[PDB]
Ligand binder design. Structure first.
Ligand SMILES: [Cl-]
Ligand SMILES: [Cl-]
Ligand SMILES: [Cl-]
Ligand SMILES: [Cl-]
Lengths: 597, 597
């Protein structure tokens, strides 16, 4: 259970972000127990931020292993009358958290929150908070790191021996690590408090019924009230226990680009918590993706959390800039490729009416780009257990978001190979079991020669395809790209279920131009997209287009990465390429609902 | 025999360059004998120029097969008292030349001149000159085109069927074709004229002895005179026949960056011809490359003939700009990668004191990047016969240039495989036989794991290496690049013979930057070069550094070509990247002679 920490009449909220001490592990930090004392001979690092790009050091950017963050934590003893909690919104990839040299918690998974109470007895007059952060990835982590597998995107013409041991990402984006999202101290009443809130809605005529389950610790009485934005109470139930329901007459529905959030206020004993909440329905019916019973057409992007110089770190001005650009362009949606995004972004999307495909950290689950899904004993991928935990934690965090309409279980896994169905079926079953709203589930399909053998066909409610007709195949032959595109997409269209692009694009360096089709130029990016839409616009089961990518982003180094991935419609500093203007024109003429009715 | 056409007291020179008619072959141009009539429904094309980039049409740029050029040729009948010659400086790749629907000549080889007399009887009051130009390349052409071999640099992740049949270059640079260099009509006396001039020099104390052989047609008397730039006669011999010698007291030697050209004036009957000529010696001795008996250090580049929009076409303002930039940067030399350059450039290098490594068209002689040098019956490369002709014609054209100090027999052939020595030994023997000055010969060595098996070791006077330590291997690991560089180059240094870099570089997009080593940025280009020089500056047999490339240039399309090849020190419009300033500083501090003495 991970409610977003907020300031309330029963809950303090103390941000610990700022300038922290920082030290690379030299192989002796745990042996010499650096967490027991002030870090010596240390640097300074902003928190929240990825650490890789803050300095000018390749040894720091390309570090392998642990680093140690630390700050002083001097708090009033009178907080000891309350329950005291340290919340880590995200520490990438793995964390060990120490207060005064006592290990308080550990966490695996770099993109979801975790928390620990501080035992009263540990809090001295002066305290040290130390966070050790591990950046290493392998066959057991999500995202996956290679072990003996070859570098496909960053391969040399002639092999060489690396100077130092390094991570081997099985994914494109740069392995930004550190204290990615805010660290905060918060409090709740000690004896009785709210641990979780679950809300589902049903629309009977113009009356919404909101079913609630309020999970609590301790013995007290539970109450719930639903308020309009302007502050009018529209439903209230007292002494309701855990489960109940209530109704809102003439409810205002949350719609894409037309958001409406009620405020759901909960009391339990002395505890107070307010959750914003939008009322909307999601259903797949035939080849339609229905939001509030209307056939939606996705217009948008796969994104990354990527800005300079914080890397993956929470950047709230850029989040607001990015949503503004989305509305400027006529987009209505994006996918959280390839990890859960910050709660601050997710809550902002609820407020702004941006639809979200919420995706796990499960990218790189692919050992043949020994079978990927062989038994662990025979060398198969070792991620399924953690994959289950990620699904649990992602849905627990994001279940109440109106903006989340579909779960993406994995990106570009080896879904055309033997054992893939056996790996994924329990994960799809888990997502359907745990999501109270029973939203659609998908996996994001890698381009593959044997596409009819993609186990997505047996599992997903929507088929989500990553396809690069005119880039990774048919480059500079867009007539051949159109023919190859049509041949495959007519197969998917024949299945009668909704399908969409979750990735399609062409690397494009701003400022490169040619009137005559030429890879990496701004004009070719436009022609690539025109060619694909010639096909997709004729297919009635094709219900959405999300480009790769919203913006240029950092990646590992190699011969096909021109200082990162250049498939953005915008540059890394959010400037529009020619194709950004193309999509503004195109999306201006396509309705959010009823394009393919 | 191909003397450069000049205006003299016995020789008219009439340039036919300008706007010509132009038509793509549609498969019927020879059947319908388009050369017999004015081209119908034709476009217009500048001559000289490559045709590929003049318009905005991909079908034109990527044309496969023949095109037809044509112009009117209305000349005075009184020229019929003279011998009338049509000179094609270069037609890329193969040509058929028609006057009034009579086929006058055909030529194979896109980068060397050819000529034909016009029979008096064919010249009507009004005439048509038609040039059919073939762009097709295969296992029998230089440069080599692939037939069934795979595309290594421009390969897709997923195979596709091309829309139309296209050339398959076995080389990086774009396959620019057309009437690349000027077409001119010239005249000589009919009955007796000079066909060729051969000069060699010997330095006895401060006296130069110039040995001459004047090849003529007809019966007349031969005379030769050598004049200073200011016009003083310094040697003269009359009625000398074909072979002879003469001496120049206190001769001014041609030196790199300090050129001096005498004027050698020849008369034969009524014919007059003037050849510029620099006096200098070239010899390899031990690990030294001696120009005028002093140990030279090459500083410069592999170039291309490449500008926008003419492609490969002769661009005389840019030739002068390029030499000016070379002198600005402190360079002393370049290689004509990967084909003979225009006579206008070669004569300008003589005038300006730029040293030249003169290279054949033999790039792509490599079928395993069936053995490359298997017998033709078993599928081996079919180029050796034409390769011999190219060597003959290149040396015949350029033998008298002081600026030419070494012949490059081939670039990046399969010289580490069986049969390579057997293929190349006759070609090296031919070059040594035909060059009157017996200049050094080399081949330019591809980077290869089995470098000790490179047959260059058995054939070349100088070992010329193309090496990409820190780009195609060890990318973004320059410490590993330095170690791998040193390990291999210490082998070459142990052989005791002169060796050099003819290629080394890193793709660099102007305007991309990072303080921290990152491929494709301007800073990484500098660090790449610093790392390599750390090694080469410590090796006493390493006698020269020529970067890849002088300037960004156009290539085929593919995932590793960011709108062409970006390894230029300068952009395509000749603007300096950071590394251009690095080399200006570095070469400013390295003498042309006696750096490694
Ligand atoms: Cl990615
Ligand atoms: Cl991509
Ligand atoms: Cl090239
Ligand atoms: Cl290259």
């Amino acid at each position: 259970a991970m409610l977003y920490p907020i300031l309330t009449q029963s809950r303090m909220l103390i941000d610990l972000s700022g300038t922290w001490r920082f030290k690379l592990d030299d192989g002796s930090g745990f042996e010499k127990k650096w967490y027991e004392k002030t870090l010596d001979d240390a640097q300074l690092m902003p928190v929240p931020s990825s650490y890789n790009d803050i300095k000018e050091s390749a040894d720091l950017r390309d570090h392998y292993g642990w680093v140690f963050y630390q700050r002083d934590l001097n708090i009033p003893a009178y907080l000891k009358t309350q329950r005291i909690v340290l919340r880590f919104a995200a520490v990438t990839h793995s964390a060990k958290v120490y207060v005064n040299g006592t290990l308080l918690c550990e966490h695996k998974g770099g993109f979801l929150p975790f928390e620990t109470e501080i035992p009263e007895n540990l809090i001295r007059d002066e305290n040290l908070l130390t966070v050790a952060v591990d950046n290493r990835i392998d066959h057991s982590t999500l995202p996956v790191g290679r072990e003996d597998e070859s570098n496909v995107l960053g391969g040399s013409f002639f092999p060489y021996t690396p100077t130092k041991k390094q991570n081997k990402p099985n994914f494109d984006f740069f392995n930004y690590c550190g204290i990615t999202r805010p660290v905060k101290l918060y409090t709740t009443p000690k004896d009785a408090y709210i641990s979780d809130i679950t809300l589902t809605s049903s629309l009977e005529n113009n009356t919404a019924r909101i079913n609630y389950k309020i999970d609590t610790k301790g013995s007290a009485h539970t109450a719930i009230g639903v308020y309009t934005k302007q502050g009018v109470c529209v439903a209230q139930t007292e002494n309701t226990g855990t489960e109940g329901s209530l109704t809102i007459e003439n409810a205002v529905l949350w719609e894409p680009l037309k958001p409406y959030l009620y405020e759901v206020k909960i009391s339990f004993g002395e505890d107070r918590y307010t959750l914003p909440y939008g009322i909307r329905s999601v259903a797949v019916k035939g080849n339609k993706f229905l939001i509030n019973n209307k056939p939606f057409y996705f217009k948008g992007y796969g994104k990354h959390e990527d800005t300079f110089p914080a890397g993956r770190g929470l950047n709230m001005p850029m989040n607001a800039k990015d949503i503004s650009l989305m509305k400027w362009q006529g987009a209505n949606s994006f996918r959280t490729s390839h990890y859960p995004y910050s709660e601050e972004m997710m809550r902002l999307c609820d407020e702004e009416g941006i639809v979200v495909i919420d995706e796990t950290t499960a990218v790189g689950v692919h050992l043949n780009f020994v079978n990927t899904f062989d038994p662990i004993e025979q060398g198969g991928i070792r991620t399924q257990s953690h994959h289950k935990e990620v699904i649990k934690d992602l849905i627990a965090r994001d279940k109440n978001h109106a903006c989340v309409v579909m779960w993406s279980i994995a990106n570009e896994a080896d879904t055309g190979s033997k054992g893939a169905y056996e790996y994924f079926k329990p994960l799809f079953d888990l997502a359907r079991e745990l999501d109270p709203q029973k939203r659609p589930c998908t996996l994001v399909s890698l381009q593959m020669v044997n596409y009819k053998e993609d186990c997505t066909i047996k599992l997903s409610d929507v088929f989500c395809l990553n396809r690069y007709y005119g880039w990774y195949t048919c480059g500079a032959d867009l007539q051949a790209a159109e023919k190859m595109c049509r041949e495959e997409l007519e197969f998917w269209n024949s299945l009668g279920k909704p399908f969409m692009y979750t990735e399609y694009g062409a690397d494009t360096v701003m400022g490169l131009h040619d009137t005559t089709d030429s890879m990496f130029t701004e004009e070719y990016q436009v022609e690539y997209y025109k060619t694909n839409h010639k096909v997709t616009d004729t297919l009635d089961c094709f219900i959405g287009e999300q480009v790769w990518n919203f913006a240029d982003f950092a990646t590992s180094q190699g011969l096909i990465r021109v200082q990162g991935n250049k498939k953005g419609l915008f540059t890394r500093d959010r400037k529009p390429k020619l194709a950004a203007h193309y999509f503004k024109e195109r999306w201006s003429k396509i309705p959010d609902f009823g394009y393919k009715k």
